[PDB]
């Protein structure tokens with residue numbers, strides 16, 4: 045039975061998609077690592093990360109995290125992130141582009 | 145070697161500048177948080193962060209971290225970062241070039 049062939053195996057996938065969420069936190073040191081460690085807990089790797097800091101004396105800053113993961117996993121992760129801070133923006137900042 | 149009790153009431157803002165370093169790590173999940181937690185240890189906040197992922201099947205990825213801190217503190221931090229991975233790129237001056 046086993047050991048016969050199996051040199052190649054195709055895994056099914058539910059198409060492809062991306063997820064992104066804007067997470068806000070205090071401009072404290074290490075605030076970002078606590079936000080990203082949650083992604084590590086769910087074993088979700090990020091593909092892009094960008095932080096924006098305003099000079100309007102804002103105590104809080106917005107950090108954009110882009111990652112690819114299942115929508116269910118994503119929703120669960122977002123719910124955990126929402127615990128730390130209220131997230132009302134779940135859209136990417138396509139308004140601002142970067143040279144990259 | 146603990147010092148004596150005292151307080152530094154002398155401060156100077158004569159020295160000012162920015163620091164940046166390119167830190168490379170494996171494309172593992174949570175690799176970035178370990179890199180950034182070191183900044184937290186030195187109480188260094190980052191002002192900009194950007195990660196680059198290639199599709200050339202590179203096991204390692206390069207993450208750019210920009211922060212403002214003392215040069216001495218920065219050098220010490222870099223030395224700690226160098227422990228985790230060899231860093232040969234330290235924000236090179238690609239703006240100018242020479243043909244020596």
Ligand SMILES: N[C@@H](Cc1ccccc1)C(=O)O
Nearest residue numbers: 089090091092174175176195
């Ligand atoms: N994929 C790695 C490195 C990385 C961080 C952020 C953006 C892109 C890549 C991680 O999740 O730690």
Ligand SMILES: N[C@@H](Cc1ccccc1)C(=O)O
Nearest residue numbers: 074075076095189190191192
């Ligand atoms: N200043 C905060 C948030 C931040 C992260 C990265 C870039 C800019 C700001 C921190 O160091 O966690």
